[PDB]
Ligand binder design. Structure first.
Ligand SMILES: NC(=O)c1ccc[n+]([C@@H]2O[C@H](COP(=O)([O-])OP(=O)(O)OC[C@H]3O[C@@H](n4cnc5c(N)ncnc54)[C@H](O)[C@@H]3O)[C@@H](O)[C@H]2O)c1
Ligand SMILES: NC(=O)c1ccc[n+]([C@@H]2O[C@H](COP(=O)([O-])OP(=O)(O)OC[C@H]3O[C@@H](n4cnc5c(N)ncnc54)[C@H](O)[C@@H]3O)[C@@H](O)[C@H]2O)c1
Ligand code: NA
Ligand code: NA
Ligand code: NA
Lengths: 336, 336
């Protein structure tokens, strides 16, 4: 029972607002789109189709009614262009900012465009939101911000030194957001996601995340790599948790704003057993090598979601195994 | 003496390197130019004349020989364009990055522009320097990185929360510089300047610094406005100490790199006593209203320069009194 979430969705259905989703055509963005349209919200999407796809939008078109779909206005555009940011903020109530170029190895290899997309793009959106006087601003942050902090589980107040240009950019999102609260009174929420997964996460590409990648390899009879000793642990978080948390943040009471929240489940799953988990779930629908560690890959990761539970009355309902069961069928249809 | 600093400056006269100065037309960049041409160095210049002036260059030209000027290649251009940053980096040995939009209140009214110049612009130069494989990289940091931390005098490893968009940019300069060391092995030195003053510091404008603003005011017989009770204090730093530190940092040994240093004197001077000093020094070349505190103004500022003294053999040799005595003539020539 997502009891607080249920109640908040009910306000939204009764008094529908206008939402902006940046990165609408990507994994998390499209999932947020799916839910808000089903809640009869008016949605304004912004995407440049860099990592995102037109087929993600086309899928969501088939998952919602006509009346619902007609309340979605899509704008092809770039968060790096401030003018575009201002144009899309007009009459927006709630801002869900997901647009960015993710991936740690990407930022190492092209820190320039990454900086532009993730810092310049963010500030453009943040500033346009302040000037449009939106009612809430919720943006995608990262567990990479913890950096070389050795403590476990990860507690928001305790971070270390950033280990990648990507870690930097997301921390800079946080800092700008705090300073926007200080100097302007503009209270935002930053969601440090931890290893999200689920339908519409891109399995292709040189930057594919481990769950869709491995899934994609098993469905093809390709080799499944484990980068090192296989002992690495991660806090895998199914999108529904992330959707719940964006919407709870969007309508949080004022005192809950200007805050950073871990978005995860609280569990630690080894790569050795993720390799196992996926196999079983895939093989329930009738269808392993080792190499090196990565420069920027931490031995262990696990969140403490106490703060979200307490402040936002957050209720993570889907753990890894059930997430994968809900996810595998999507990849079957998608990869054929 | 300035014996280690004199060791280097004499080494440079005998054996010239190629230097890149960004912000070369501004206050600090143009003083850096004066020194480097006087030591027969080949200097590459970059400036867009945004807060700097062609007259600062023109002035340097009159203080150096024809053959010294001949080795100054000046490029009108913008650090925000990566291509420009790479063109001005070819053949360069030591980078002195001074190009930025300073002032806190500028960044509160227009955070986008300050982000573009101070974060994007900085990263371009860092990135190009990295690629060009330069011998050293030294950049203009800021005492505002201490933020809200209560300690006084200020010590480099202890910092708090950035209190404005400008502070965020300068702190992010430091973070990126530490990340570049980690990810590419490219070791830089960042200089937390504290309230620099001297020749060619713009007395005109909304954001003119206190010393040049008051010196202009007393020569014109305009009002000297003291914001507050006048017990507000600062570590006023004469340019030669900044120049000194930049050259020390450019030719610093490997282990002294990837470090942040306070550039100041270690002293505290109140606006009250300061107005006394300015006035007294100006009367030897023969020629006040209190008001509401600047909002969010730092109450007291003072650097601990122990790190610079031990690791870079810094000598904070010119205190505020002597500096003002050396700078007063320049403002008389400039305003008549
Ligand atoms: N996926 C995770 O586990 C995870 C972990 C930490 C942080 N995040 C952050 O969550 C957010 C959601 O990303 P995702 O995982 O769905 O990846 P994604 O690539 O599927 O989504 C990113 C979306 O942003 C769009 N976009 C990128 N740059 C843009 C720009 N300049 N202008 C307009 N649109 C732009 C892309 O086209 C894409 O639709 C990102 O900020 C990501 O960094 C995700
Ligand atoms: N003066 C101080 O008390 C103080 C204190 C802390 C930090 N700093 C830093 O020292 C450096 C220089 O300061 P200053 O006092 O000489 O200021 P300044 O305004 O005199 O110098 C800045 C110079 O950079 C140029 N510039 C700005 N944006 C540019 C861009 N995008 N591309 C190319 N050139 C650009 C300006 O036109 C100017 O010539 C800056 O990084 C500043 O933030 C100064
Ligand atoms: Na409104
Ligand atoms: Na509410
Ligand atoms: Na180096």
């Amino acid at each position: 029972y997502m009891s607080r979430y249920e109640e908040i969705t009910q306000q939204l259905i009764f008094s529908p607002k206008t939402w902006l989703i940046t990165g609408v055509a990507g994994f998390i963005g499209s999932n947020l789109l799916e839910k808000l349209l089903k809640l009869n919200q008016v949605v304004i999407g912004l995407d440049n189709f860099s990592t995102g796809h037109q087929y993600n939008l086309d899928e969501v078109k088939t998952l919602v009614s006509t009346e619902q779909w007609s309340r979605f206005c899509f704008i092809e555009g770039d968060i790096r262009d401030l003018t575009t940011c201002e144009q899309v903020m007009k009459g927006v109530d709630h801002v869900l900012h997901q647009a960015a170029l993710g991936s740690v190895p990407r930022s190492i290899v092209d820190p320039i465009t990454t900086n532009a997309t993730n810092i310049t793009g963010f500030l453009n959106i943040l500033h346009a939101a302040k000037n449009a006087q939106v009612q809430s601003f919720t943006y995608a942050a990262s567990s990479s911000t913890y950096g070389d902090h050795p403590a476990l589980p990860k507690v928001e107040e305790n971070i270390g030194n950033p280990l990648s240009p990507y870690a930097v950019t997301k921390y800079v999102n946080e800092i700008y957001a705090q300073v926007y609260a200080r100097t302007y009174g503009f209270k935002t929420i930053g969601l440090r996601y931890f290893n999200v997964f689920g339908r519409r996460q891109d399995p292709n590409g040189a930057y594919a995340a481990v769950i869709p990648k491995w899934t994609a390899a098993m469905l093809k009879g390709d080799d499944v790599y484990i980068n090192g000793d296989g002992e690495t642990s991660r806090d895998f978080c199914y999108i529904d948790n992330v959707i719940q948390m964006n919407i709870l943040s969007a309508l949080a009471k004022d005192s809950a704003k200007d805050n950073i929240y871990n978005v995860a489940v609280g569990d630690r799953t080894t790569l050795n057993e993720l390799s196992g988990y996926i196999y079983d779930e895939l093989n329930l629908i009738h269808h392993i090598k080792y190499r090196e560690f990565r420069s920027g890959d931490v031995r262990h990761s696990q969140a403490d979601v106490t703060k979200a539970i307490d402040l936002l009355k957050y209720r993570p309902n889907i753990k890894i195994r059930e997430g994968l069961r809900l996810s595998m069928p999507w990849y079957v249809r998608f990869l054929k």
